[PDB]
Symmetry: D2
Subunit: 455 residues, 4 copies
């Protein structure tokens, strides 16, 4: 729409597209921060709306906001949550480090929309004020950190954790099924003593179980909300019960154990909870990286690789099955590792009463949660559930290896066993061929003595 | 549009939305790689089209493609370049590590579109084939790396460099203007010997000039194109003149010094040129980080900070002017540092004949180029061009410092000078007050002897 | 020299040294840089050998004579008697096989002497057959890494963290009544007490402690008993739990046998995770150190709200210039921990099948970070934090110089009017009061009674 | 002990040591970890003092007697006579003030003895007044950093890089005729010669060399002469160029005076950049090392296309198990360089106003990376690369075992038919020929004449 609407702020009047619900400040920012393409994530946008919704409810309970104005704001917020205004937040991540502009973006959209809900119009003659009504008892300084933690905790709890548990269950099932399949071990990439495929996969399982616990230990710190500290953490200009009540309201509507941060100065001056929580994520990224690599190497082939297992072929060189799911997963794992550095740099750069590296920190954090959750979901349904062992290939490899000589020790002694091993290795023979060439035992004895199942 | 079109590939038939120009493979990928929100950058998409356009022209010149089919493909490519099909590439960055799926995405869109251009229809009865016609003489393996370098070089040359030069010119102008303004130096954050504001800004200037040269040194390696190496770099299934001709065509249509890579094995097996080029970028990120910080600290205030300079107030606590432009710039600088780690990890993970961490590498690389270019453009026009010195504040600071005592040495000796310095420091006085209290000189002599302009 | 030998033949080793043929061979094959195994890792490896000897003896696998000799030789390493006996570089075999053999040879040679025997090929104690009994480099090195890591965190890092926290806690309490100007985006903002600001530093350190403590249980899991590939082939069924108990006994740390030996050998997951908590602490310390040095900047042209002890001599003619050296040392080592994290992440992500072979590098970085953080906190504490003092005059001067206090006037005069004097003060370069009085909007008496900074 | 003193008073220093009061005071204030200044940096700092003495003498600022004594003392440091005289930790003042004083005191004390004088407060040469004449820690440390950096890259890193390149170049030439199976996404792909594959490694190293060479000119710029804040206050107008010339003369490296002293003191930009080229080299080496060890995996259940020298002894009963130890050492140090880059980036981005105070940490990481890469290439070269040999039988077995060769049949039989035998071979577990013959689509003679792998 070409038609503009004149809105204004302390700096003056500016044209805003008539069909949009934002105001003067959102428009100024839009024109001042034309940097790249990254905008606020939908999960962050919704957490911002949830925060405003909680503040409105509590402001009402304290008699700071009229029931009508408060219910209108609460209703406009629900529409945002319902995904009806996704097009109303055009601000880039690369804005003011406190996220002030996005806070104002939400204030204006909810003010203009709540006005209409009250039978009013959007624009300078609206019924609900962005600052006085929607931003009542708040500050960008304590609102953005609160929205960051709301989004972070819900994404970990609702997206990440469930997917982690599912993959764990799948691998655990595979572990039990392939428990009797003995295969050759590999240390340093060299042939080593045997182990069952099931024991090897149980390693992947335990890795995932351990990761779940570390992620869980990081949750309580993220559950601490900064809401109530206002500008510098002192809580100047708020009701003494506000902080506690707003945390309770949030916990109630989200069903997540949110609590008000015991120390508001720590809450506003740092992103510590997120720096630490992401530490657990880079840990999971390292574990997934290893699992994905094992999968693609074990499935490499079909003729000139390892080929011990087969994975589902998901897209259309006959046996050439590229491990695409493993490639997407390993790629996003590198991404999480980089995001950690950006997060650490931003987290270590706080100055005095406020850390102003927040949009970047939440941008990286929520991306890692999406990548990990979706990555595990994809890898699980398109690869993990269909992993199958190539029994013929596994057996062939076992029998062609020199690593089984050890079973001859108790029968013919170490020196003769080592001799057979040396002969086979020098002559390019199998242990059985070398053993028979030497005449140290019959084929029947070899077949009876070397049972890889007793490894 | 709910209506589907049945398309098919080696794996079978699949429904594709009737209103879209993609095919069966793009549809399968879409459904298999539902991971996060990152899709191919527009600059990468256009570079892919440019590559296909060059291959078509050359295939024609070699009599491998009919003039009509080749011109149709060339015309469809131009529409992509014109921005008419931005909605035709829905594939995530998190796909097959070779970028095979996006290569196929371009093949199908151009095949279906060129068909229509020839009076034909889109779908299984199209006139132009994705594989046989559009992907003629190519492989995803050598096409994606080529598209990566095309995008990379053009973004550096057309976006990054020009903005760097502009900021440099602005600071250079500011350097000359404030050449006579003496201010107090700061080492370790402590008051130090004086220097002009202009000398201090000249440091920023030289930093930018040096960065320009490093970025320039990285260009020739990025200019090397992999096109012609095909699957493993041997150039199997191509015309002996192909590689050279396709590089010449690209150079001609883009006006960039593109050359065919002397070693195709290095070109396909690694992202080395990009790992190195990004090294120069993380260097510029470090330099910009320092310049931005100096700017915000020097402008901190208005009463309780340093306040030596004033910057343009771009948005609507009277003198409270938040350095938002500096905050956006410092944030994106951390981002570039993280992108470097993700890039290094992907670049070091090649295996044998092909590196399969490409989409992630180009995703991070192009983001850093956008952030740096746009960041400098924004910082320059919304801050750098309006930097002004607070002469009164600067002078006040100079006169209140103990660092000017050194000018008394040649007149009254070191011991008396050091005595005055100690008195002022212990008693919280100014050098002049301490000097007069002691009676070592008159105010007229002090005013004549301590001339900060001769620092 | 002396002549020792192995399967590849003989090689001359300096007679005055206790290491053998394999250590000598490695010394010539891995001549990379100057980094060697740190003492804490050498001790952990010795402790691991000591525990293996006791258990092997208990299981009737080793003779009491040999077992006691091995433990005695091991106690001498812990006592610092053989530091010069471990010359191997960090940059060796990814499994730490070299260092495992270096310990086996040194321990076997010395254990021979202790038994009336001699060092060298005539020795009474066999490095492979005796000292390395029931073990493998694959499960021994990872065990040594966890022992060194858990003990370093418990005995060095945590105590120093607590101490620094107690110190900062005393300071916040002491300065609970000093009101100062707040700063957001580096700009003047609303007031807060110096004590409140310091309490933020305290809360940060307290949170970090619980974070570090959450990483300990995974690091306490030992690989010993997993043997070559994790199966435990060639070990007594009780070996794994017994050696874990023994180690817990002699170190007084809660070590346990890893529930899954495959995960224990194929990865360095516990350290990748534990190090996550450490880089988190590094980010926090960086912020604290920066606040301190910025607040102490000056003496005349900075912020100068606090003073810190001057530890280094200064120029006679330049009194007042006190460089925040401890802050510089701390910020530098913090950048180091961040880099160490990346190196560890890459190694931790690079395991293949049954064994991760990036171990010496991983432990090298991990132990360095613990060392840096522990000593860094101690130094910063004793040489800086304990001596943080406020420059009360400077703090008040800035407080009464800012326009931020105009908010108190709003409750006593219309927003626009209160803002009016603020505009004048700002534009004329006057203070809030001077502007208020000149504008005739109030008297000195009522102004002073309205603008109470101690009431936030 | 001996009693030395400074502005803060006196302090006892061990009599058998040449350092003074400030070094002794720092030794007690900066007790952090175990990292000290590396020899190359100590030498660079001595060289810097040597050059400053000659120039000061030439300008008539220092007496020939004192100037020559200072240079002689400096030559003794280069000769390794005083390594034990520099005990200061890396984790000190961000400007490297301590180490600058450590050198001044050691040099002054020794220069006194050299002049018939004595060490201690009775010395004839003053550390501050003489050895540090016309200088400042602010411009001396950055200069020492560049001297150490440029020389390390030129004398150690580059020669080793070239050598390793020449070796790999010989190998590719030698194996130019050995056809092997290609691998993309880890899957069997079209053929390429072993020599072509190795040529990729060569091209990578050659590109890295030009990249490293592009970073040298910026590192060659010296800060000496900028003095305290970059203005050059208290220096003779020709001092900066003269000392730069002197240094170029004695080191034989192309050092020049930094065009802009403000950029030189306020940043570590040249090293942040130069290190970018180094992490690039680290990424390349990582890939090369991984290819080598994967290609040599086995002996029976891996790829086994090549064999590499067995440098460490092995179990008698386990012949064939040759762990790629040099590859493990190289991959580990590569992860290290990546981490070092992050630490340097953080320090390089943290400068404030006139001086960057994250220097000791930056140079600590930079010199370590050069050290790791240089020694790493040497070790990998002599102990691995020179001995890379192909397992021709294994290579052919895999080649004739893959279905990838069916492409040659297409030109002699319809796509679908050629694909038909491929389907059967794959499904039945047969080879291309066995399937082709069993399907009766051709005879052994014509098959063998059509499938020529040596013709790509």
């Amino acid at each position: 729409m070409n038609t503009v609407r004149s809105e204004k702020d302390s700096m003056g009047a500016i044209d805003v597209p008539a069909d949009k619900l934002w105001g003067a400040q959102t428009q100024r920012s839009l024109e001042h921060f034309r940097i790249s393409t990254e905008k606020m994530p939908t999960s962050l946008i919704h957490a911002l709306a949830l925060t405003k919704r909680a503040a409105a409810k509590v402001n009402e309970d304290l008699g700071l906001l009229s029931e009508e104005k408060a219910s209108a704001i609460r209703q406009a917020a629900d529409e945002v949550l319902a995904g009806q205004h996704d097009d109303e937040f055009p601000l880039a991540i690369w804005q003011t480090g406190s996220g002030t502009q996005s806070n104002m973006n939400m204030n204006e959209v909810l003010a203009n929309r709540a006005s209409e809900l009250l039978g009013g119009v959007r624009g300078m003659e609206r019924k609900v004020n962005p600052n006085d009504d929607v931003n009542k008892s708040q500050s960008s300084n304590d609102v953005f950190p609160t929205a960051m933690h709301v989004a972070a905790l819900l994404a970990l709890r609702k997206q990440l954790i469930p997917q982690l548990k599912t993959l764990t269950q799948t691998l655990n099932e595979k572990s039990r099924a392939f428990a009797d399949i003995v295969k050759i071990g590999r240390t340093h990439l060299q042939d080593a003593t045997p182990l069952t495929l099931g024991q090897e996969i149980s390693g992947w399982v335990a890795m995932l179980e351990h990761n779940l616990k570390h992620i869980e230990y990081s949750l309580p710190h993220v559950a601490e909300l900064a809401l109530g500290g206002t500008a510098v953490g002192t809580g100047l200009n708020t009701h003494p019960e506000y902080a506690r009540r707003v945390a309770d309201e949030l916990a109630v509507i989200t069903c997540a154990p949110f609590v008000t941060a015991p120390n508001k100065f720590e809450a506003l001056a740092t992103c510590d909870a997120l720096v630490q929580a992401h530490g657990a994520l880079k840990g999971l990224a390292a574990s997934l990286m290893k699992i994905a690599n094992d999968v693609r190497w074990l499935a490499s082939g079909p003729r000139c690789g390892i080929g011990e297992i087969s994975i589902p072929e998901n897209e259309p060189m006959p046996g050439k099955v590229n491990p695409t799911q493993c490639e997407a997963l390993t790629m996003l794992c590198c991404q999480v590792m980089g995001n950690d550095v950006a997060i650490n740099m931003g987290g270590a750069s706080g100055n005095f009463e406020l850390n102003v590296f927040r949009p970047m920190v939440i941008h990286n954090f929520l991306q890692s949660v999406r990548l990990l959750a979706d990555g595990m979901e994809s890898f699980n349904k398109h690869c993990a559930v269909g992993i199958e062992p190539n029994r013929e290939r596994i057996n062939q490899l076992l029998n062609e290896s020199l690593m089984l000589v050890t079973a001859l020790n108790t029968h013919i002694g170490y020196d003769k066993a080592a001799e057979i091993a040396k002969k086979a290795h020098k002559e390019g023979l199998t242990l059985k061929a070398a053993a028979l060439a030497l005449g140290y035992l019959s084929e029947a004895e070899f077949d009876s003595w070397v049972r890889p199942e007793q490894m």
